[PDB]
Chain length 268, copies 4
């Protein structure tokens, strides 16, 4: 029936209805998956958003910078899905970089405290999540993370591109660990998407120039992409994550699957 | 329901029940795809082999080097699927390299006549097949080709590695043409599989040093791979082709997916 | 004392004074190298160009497609540099792709005959050259080839990009064969340069659309390049070839050195 | 004529005579470079070590984790080379990762505080150094960092690989900043060298398992290398850094140059 029919998947990262994790959770539910969701900080707002999903799914609090939340994760998840029952999928749609290391502040000027917070959330946490959830994962299982091609440097992205470079390395190692459990670990490298991750720069909140630079990136992304790129559509990226959570890419681990319209394969 | 339900797919490259294409065809038929099969040279024998598939499919002759075969291909494929109906998928599982450019023969002792023969069949033919079948493809279609990671040089593979490097470049350009049709173009880079592509070197036909060279590569592949690698199992590769033929990787084009157990992501 | 002082280098690829090879030859000679030059087709015309070099260097005929020129090459070089004397360096600055495979002809409309000729001259010839000169090369030696980054597809380059992909793979295997002689084999991936290789598309011989598209590429290259890119200055490329010909990159082989202003490291 | 005649070069990262930076400093001096050295913690040790170098050079103190050191560095460098004089080269041979992130400790057991210390010292400090030293750098200058290929996961290295992956990214953005000063920024990706960076794992201090892992890697590195690899000789690496500090690679920036024997270019 569904692509993930009878699968128990954990989906992290829903904040708004435009969050990549929301469309991942939506497509996953449409494809028969039973979900457990994790949210950070504004939990009464996340509960309101996740209520708009095709189905009821338990919401658990998880700050990946909180040692206690990580220590109790597996326990709280098992309680949510029933004892003796395990996870088949894990979705890491978590990331952040403070305004000093991303946007208009000069690259050099970002303090290591802010860069460190950014690497802990967007890169180190991918391993943190796998450490906590892998002992409650079933053989054949899948851990998918969200990436943004960091092989080439670009304007404004700055220390987020550095944190993504680190995430890619982490993923490669997580795969070594996950393989002992019969679990795959991969990243989906998406093109730009109009979520909370971009809303300040796009909305002219960092100035007119900053907004212009992103619009050139989104325009150029669409040009290069042989099959086009709609920065307003999160569903192609959502579908890709669901391909990796399914049993249809069973010899793929420690890798990057590009869901970007084909932009990264083209120069112009 | 089936992953490729209601999809019309052409599958090329079946020569034995062990061929990568045989597994792609069987898996696709299991997932409700209506196939058309192209075969080369020994067709009376290909029909005997294709009769072993889960369902009956039309068998057409196609020599990628015969221009009459290529020019008639769309018309002949149409005749088989019926007028008004178009293809939703194309599988290119065709490769060849003369003995002078592959195995024990010294890399410098390969006549260009033979390297050109190998590049025509292994690389150029991917653009030829796309040229012929793109006019009879439906928007959202998928063209998948078979790859063996040529990013690093290896013993024995020699000019076949060169042919594969040319192929990755062809794929990137086919994606550009295919995009105009709303069609995706990708390659599945597989790990070594015990087909007729490897039978001579493996069966000790190119001497001891050549067979030992392969064994070391083969062993190293399975140990590098975080989830392992089985040369005697084409099913994980076959599932990956089907994953790309499906609607679940809709933002991936001009790209390479690695169905290699994750081996290319590890040094040791 | 010069960077290539007392070195015997063979430099191929001079046709006009705008050629990359001419600049490689000028600088190498400026750096104390003893040269042996190889030209193709119109050698009386090439001799009138090589007369404009800082020093007198013997000129030898070499059509890379001519099986007799390669079989007799090493003998002609030894006769030119003196018996008992060996080459310390070799420069491959050869490339060609017919009008059907490059420019405004549809990528699909290139006949294999024409593609094969361009692959013979631009990739296979690098291996032909090394087969010929490795036996008359000194340990510590250096074979350098010219490349144009083929990792990402682009407009108008078409089958030349496919041949540059083939070349990259060929170099990797050449480094294997060369290492048995203590010789390094590498590619210098240069950005675009105003030579006879680009003069038609730059000059409008291919129409407005074509011209506009190459200008866009040039503009963007210099934009992306953190140190800038001047398509009218072959000197930084020549200097890079000389660096690989020296003993200053002694642990680098089967590789690509980018002399492109850093363009390939920047998305925009 | 020395390759670096009259070039005021800052060299960081000396601790012993086996340190990569010591050999970089030695060759730079052998090549007529005027040096300013930077040392950390054990400054009496570094002084005794630098006294063995070909010439007398000022040794300044720099802990990359200390903001006072970084802010004062530029003025202290000016004082050393002379008023009205700027640097022509800057060498970053600094790196560190605690035992929790490197060795036998499981990848999932490395606390973020430690991973963060490693990334601070190994990746972030490259930007810090450039931030401080670019305003006292001359046009045509070079910033060179030390790297160890992080594109593939491997045993033991774990989080240092994650840090190197981040360093590559930082270098790519440093090139964007340096380009404004007419300065190139690059990394030398070396193969493994018997320095203090490896001495614990090679010496058997992390047990048999860990020791055997390095043994396999070191042996594998030499067999993959077409020109070979000797981990007891840093001079080829040292030369390569000097090649990047010179005017012979003037079109290369935001890049990685592999002084690894060509090991990264071969699978076997
Ligand atoms: N939008 C894009 O252009 C784009 C492109 C490629 C990749 N991505 C990545 O996709 C992922 C999802 O981002 P998005 O674009 O949907 O933005 P988003 O802000 O909608 O989602 C990111 C999530 O990260 C969460 N988060 C932040 N700090 C956290 C902490 N300490 N603990 C737990 N969760 C925390 C936020 O609450 C939010 O739910 C991120 O990794 C992002 O880098 C985004
Ligand atoms: N098994 C491996 O080691 C391996 C690994 C990665 C990729 N591949 C690729 O997968 C594909 C399928 O190979 P396989 O491993 O199943 O072995 P195979 O020998 O069964 O497949 C090769 C196919 O190409 C066909 N062919 C050869 N010349 C042709 C021509 N002129 N016209 C039309 N068809 C022609 C053959 O008849 C055969 O069916 C090839 O492209 C191969 O390079 C193989
Ligand atoms: N100009 C650029 O933008 C650019 C960029 C990157 C790489 N390159 C490469 O540099 C190399 C030199 O090209 P160039 O830019 O100096 O232009 P060019 O056209 O002046 O030089 C190419 C040389 O290749 C020679 N050649 C062609 N067919 C031959 C054959 N059968 N045998 C022997 N020699 C033959 C030509 O006679 C010519 O001397 C080529 O490999 C080219 O692909 C050029
Ligand atoms: N030997 C290898 O296997 C290898 C391979 C590739 C790259 N490298 C790199 O080469 C560089 C030098 O390493 P090495 O092999 O010479 O070993 P090393 O231990 O001699 O060098 C590390 C240096 O970093 C300095 N350092 C450490 N912490 C610091 C801090 N907080 N502030 C300032 N300086 C600090 C020390 O003075 C020390 O000299 C490093 O970046 C290393 O990662 C080493
Ligand atoms: C609610 C207002 N949102 C913001 O401020 C967000 C939060 C933060 N995004 C993130 O962490 C973030 C970015 C990404 C994409 C890889 N994946 N993630 C989680 C930055 N940012 C912006 O808009 C931008 C400001 O400079 C930019 C430069 C490039 C792209 C976005 C912004
Ligand atoms: C039935 C007789 N088989 C053979 O001779 C086959 C046919 C031919 N393979 C092919 O073209 C071929 C190889 C591949 C894998 C990428 N994909 N394809 C179509 C060569 N080869 C061998 O075994 C080998 C001889 O050296 C080798 C070195 C490495 C691998 C195989 C052989
Ligand atoms: C003398 C008149 N010039 C030409 O016709 C040359 C000869 C031929 N170049 C070559 O083989 C050639 C090209 C390159 C660069 C990698 N390296 N090499 C030897 C094509 N070409 C052109 O201008 C172009 C026509 O479409 C183009 C698209 C892109 C770039 C150039 C042209
Ligand atoms: C003082 C005795 N040596 C040590 O303890 C050193 C110091 C520290 N290495 C470093 O920071 C370090 C390592 C490297 C190479 C990229 N570049 N750098 C700055 C760890 N380490 C070891 O030997 C190793 C322990 O597991 C290992 C696994 C692989 C390689 C070395 C060790």
């Amino acid at each position: 029936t569904g692509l993930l029919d009878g699968k128990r998947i954990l989906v992290s990262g829903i904040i708004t209805d435009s969050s990549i994790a929301f469309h991942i959770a939506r497509v996953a539910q449409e494809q028969g998956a039973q979900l457990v969701l994790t949210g950070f900080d504004r939990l009464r707002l996340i509960q309101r958003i996740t209520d708009r999903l095709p189905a009821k799914a338990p919401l658990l609090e998880l700050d990946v910078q909180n040692e206690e939340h990580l220590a109790s994760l597996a326990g709280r998840v098992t309680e949510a899905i029933g004892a003796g029952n395990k996870l088949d999928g894990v979705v890491h749609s978590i990331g952040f970089m403070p305004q000093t290391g991303m946007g208009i502040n000069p690259f050099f000027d970002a303090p290591y405290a802010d860069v460190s917070k950014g690497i802990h959330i967007s890169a180190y946490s991918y391993a943190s999540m796998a450490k906590a959830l892998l002992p409650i994962m079933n053989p054949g299982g899948s851990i998918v993370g969200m990436d943004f091609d960091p092989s080439r440097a670009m304007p404004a992205y700055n220390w987020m591109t550095v944190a993504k470079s680190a995430l890619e390395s982490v993923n490669r190692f997580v795969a070594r660990e996950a393989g002992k459990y019969g679990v795959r670990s991969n990243l989906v490298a998406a093109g730009p998407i109009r979520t909370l991750a971009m809303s300040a720069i796009v909305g002219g909140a960092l100035g007119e120039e900053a907004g212009a630079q992103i619009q050139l990136l989104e325009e150029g992304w669409d040009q290069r992409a042989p099959i086009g790129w709609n920065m307003k559509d999160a569903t192609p990226v959502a579908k890709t994550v669901c391909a990796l959570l399914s049993d249809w890419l069973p010899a793929t681990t420690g890798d990057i699957i590009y869901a970007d319209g084909g932009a990264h394969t083209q120069l112009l």
